[PDB]
Design a protein around this ligand. Structure first.
Ligand SMILES: Nc1ncnc2c1ncn2[C@@H]1O[C@H](COP(=O)(O)O)[C@@H](O)[C@H]1O
Ligand SMILES: Nc1ncnc2c1ncn2[C@@H]1O[C@H](COP(=O)(O)O)[C@@H](O)[C@H]1O
Ligand SMILES: Nc1ncnc2c1ncn2[C@@H]1O[C@H](COP(=O)(O)O)[C@@H](O)[C@H]1O
Ligand SMILES: Nc1ncnc2c1ncn2[C@@H]1O[C@H](COP(=O)(O)O)[C@@H](O)[C@H]1O
Ligand SMILES: O=C[C@H](O)[C@H](O)[C@H](O)COP(=O)(O)O
Ligand SMILES: O=C[C@H](O)[C@H](O)[C@H](O)COP(=O)(O)O
Ligand SMILES: O=C[C@H](O)[C@H](O)[C@H](O)COP(=O)(O)O
Ligand SMILES: O=C[C@H](O)[C@H](O)[C@H](O)COP(=O)(O)O
Lengths: 274, 274, 274, 274
């Protein structure tokens, strides 16, 4: 297998290819004057199985660039193309939340199904979206790498899921830290934050309103050191400043989405799925 | 048939639907906080044949937005979807100009072929790109509307094609103005600009280097009033200022690509192809 | 005086320089790889009084590009620089609408005051913002050019201001069309739309919610042909589609802000203010 | 003193305020529908001396946002405002490299001089640009934090400055690693890479052409483990992929400019300058 760097995951692709003990296939990427995307496989591709690693922070650009990379790889032989999209755009469009809406991830699933043979992503908004794929849909989990990152800096804490739906993440981290978990329902459904360190984990932190709320509250409940983590740190606008004011000790996310707090890497999570 | 407005051609769609004596189907379009595209068909769709009019100035956004609109229309019935993309992005990637390059328009042609039943565009960079489509590929011509726009403001001129490859456009306009045509090869292959009004037409004006050159020269040859026209006025950066300095009297383009000189509309050119 | 083209008003600058019977001073503009702005005065500047015409659709880019152009012009002699900013960004920040907010136009007024000797803009959100300038603050009005555009296509109509604060524009247009004016307060404070053509004018159409409302209502009141006009057609997202569905016959704006309906030019309005 | 977070340095501001044992002043930042910037100081400001930390990756946005934050802080009391701009945009425009060009950093220096009382930046392209400021112009150095980062992972290496002008950085790092330094002039002016680990440091890595070259060469000269570092990792386009192919073992930059390799923080470098 050869590893192809997408434009948006050049360092993750490198880390992955390093773990796989492979040389990174040089791939040229540029924008024409009008801004159109240009991809070209510089190195020679003997192997006929390629792995494309390109996250989708810039949703549309990533989608079109992937469509073009596939065309260039097929045209170079490669019988099997595996697409690694750490952050998969449009996954929040599970269903028709209103009449006339378009189920985005479904439409794109159809396209991915005709251009790549396998799709691997990290912590999708919803795993049921696999039903839309006529190809293998793999999803790894980074919560554990997050749990490990903070296990070092939290004195016997309690894991908390901002909302009941994030409970699974809380539990997972809970296991790796040997702590107790629970979720907010506003106050924790069971446990009490009084005088304890807290580790709040969720899959995404977008505007930061969900966490800001949990953080502010937990502090008012007498919690001590609090660290907020998430797989995809979208952190829009002043999200970070929002959490920092709320009192968090630190905010930490992975490199599935570039942010000022993408301290944890999913490189290994990806390698084990290949 | 119903006319669906893409986000990038809202006024052209209106003009077209007006000519077709149809009501414009209200279509909701917005961006989520993270910038993902959101489309929703607000009005009810009884008819089962829709026409999508969305040019691609923002190449990637237009492509993904089209992919989502189709998904929403199929999901609403509509057995036949005709996509009108006045300006078709990635059409300059005709072939592999180097080993390892991706034939962009080919890859996207494959996608258009699986999501729409027919594709109509105005003055593609190359018409041979139809070979890539497993569906009807129609291409109209706006040169005539351009010729008509200036016939009014040029005292017995001569039509000129910047390069030999733009000759066809020159001739076409030439016919509608009853003037003589020719092309630059640097000087006009035959005719002479001395003391005459000149109408230079080409399909695209990107950086403006091609025209700036023709204009500067023709002026040095004693040409009088010069008007530069093109179907797609990409006009990147200081392109316009470049031509104005060169001495053009006016620059005029159509509405297939929004610019400060999109004075001519292709609405009717489109209607006749439907 | 010499006319300097900003990057965002290249065609307006040309039209203005044409009316002033002057040659447009060639100005180079480009972006470095990292996207920083680069300006260079290509032609020689003997005259010591320059006029910069650069609207601010891309607010921040326009502000910094203006800051750099001034530096280049002073460095070339030019004792007096007049800045023409058809659309003046940040003008909606009149005052502190909340404790801790920044009065944007005030901060920028201070900057304009130290880099240009005179500022001319078309239809500011609020004219009181002149108090913030330690230099001459001129503001022209395009409503008349708008009134003239439609006088040709509306059978004895009535001018309407969407809100009481847009009354002034309604009246102005009212005068040039000899029709009666009035404003919505929801229904017209006096006149009745029943069986009449309507011309609704306002200074800005952003999301389109204000007009969409007026249009829908007036139609329900039995109005006939309706045309919506505005000086600055910001028309965000699906604004146009919104108005078209509401039933407007046409939407028309000026070239102070590039849109698909910038059919009217303020070139002359500007020339008379110089 | 209070620490104000700019939108582009929210995490660095937090780290700095943490080191300063101060609470981060909550600052609201958002974009209106048309994209204009909106800033509001949410918390109360008793102290009359503020420190603004906002790097300029998005050059123009950062400049205007700073102009607005100052206006809001003065309006809140604050007699002294210190601006920390880790990465200072437009610093490469030292002088007029051509007739008619604008000395960008000079024009902006004038503005910074009238809105802030002190300016602190990390590793400017040129320090002579201080001549343009009528206020205190401080510049810290991150090379040492970079040297420290790699001292841990390089077996007795040699520090190399890509070009003679980056020599100073090489020497600095050289001191902290006790290794020998030198520069490329193509080959190293003195030392030889044969069988040795190499640490190449420069202030900026933009397109990556400078380093890619050094790396490729040094490898051809038999160098072993090579690590490339820089203060500002602009890393445009495929820059990283370019270096990785060239053979670098790792690329590392600071958080003055967000990138996928901003592993080293300048928080402390900044704190010591306050
Ligand atoms: N990229 C996005 N950002 C924010 N909201 C989204 C996005 N994509 C879809 N949505 C909406 O988010 C809501 C998600 O509901 P849920 O999955 O239950 O959290 C629906 O109203 C979706 O239309
Ligand atoms: N969007 C674009 N802008 C500029 N050049 C392009 C674009 N798409 C492709 N090209 C290149 O333009 C050249 C076109 O050659 P031709 O079609 O003969 O004019 C080839 O080197 C293409 O790779
Ligand atoms: N560019 C903008 N777009 C939308 N709203 C804005 C903009 N600039 C300021 N505002 C806000 O618009 C409101 C305008 O009130 P008014 O001037 O009475 O219409 C205040 O809450 C301002 O903060
Ligand atoms: N942001 C930038 N990116 C790339 N080049 C720039 C930038 N700003 C200025 N320049 C140009 O870079 C060259 C720098 O020369 P030097 O400072 O000797 O490396 C001059 O021709 C400048 O006009
Ligand atoms: O179930 C979990 C929710 O989807 C996330 O908590 C939510 O998407 C995060 O959004 P925000 O940070 O803007 O509150
Ligand atoms: O054959 C015609 C050429 O393709 C066009 O003249 C060319 O694409 C226009 O480009 P520019 O205005 O940047 O010179
Ligand atoms: O007084 C007039 C109002 O300021 C305008 O009607 C308003 O700003 C237009 O905004 P929108 O088109 O988003 O409703
Ligand atoms: O003196 C040092 C040079 O300014 C830098 O080496 C240069 O600016 C880096 O540019 P690039 O990575 O695009 O070669």
């Amino acid at each position: 297998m050869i590893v192809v760097s997408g434009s948006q995951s050049q360092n993750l692709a490198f880390k992955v290819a390093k773990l796989l003990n492979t040389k990174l296939t040089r791939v040229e990427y540029k924008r024409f004057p009008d801004n159109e995307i240009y991809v070209r496989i510089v190195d020679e591709i003997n192997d006929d199985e390629a792995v494309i690693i390109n996250t989708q922070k810039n949703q549309n650009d990533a989608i079109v660039e992937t469509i073009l990379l596939c065309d260039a790889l097929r045209d170079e032989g490669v019988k099997k193309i595996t697409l690694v999209a750490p952050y998969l755009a449009y996954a929040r469009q599970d269903k028709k939340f209103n009449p006339g809406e378009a189920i985005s991830i479904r439409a794109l699933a159809k396209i991915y199904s005709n251009i790549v043979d396998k799709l691997i992503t990290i912590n999708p908004h919803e795993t049921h979206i696999k039903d839309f794929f006529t190809i293998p849909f793999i999803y790894g989990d980074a919560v554990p790498k997050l749990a490990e990152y903070v296990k070092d800096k939290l004195n016997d804490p309690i894991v908390l899921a901002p909302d009941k739906g994030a409970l699974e993440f809380a539990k997972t981290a809970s296991k790796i830290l040997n702590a107790e978990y629970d979720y907010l329902e506003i106050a924790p459904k069971t446990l009490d934050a009084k005088d304890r360190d807290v580790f709040i984990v969720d899959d995404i932190i977008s505007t930061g309103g969900t966490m800001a709320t949990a953080v502010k509250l937990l502090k008012e409940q007498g919690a001590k050191k609090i660290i907020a983590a998430c797989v995809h740190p979208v952190l829009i606008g002043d999200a970070l400043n929002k959490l920092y004011s709320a009192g968090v000790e630190e905010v930490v996310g992975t490199d599935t989405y570039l942010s000022e707090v993408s301290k944890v890497s999913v490189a290994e999570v990806i390698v084990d799925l290949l």
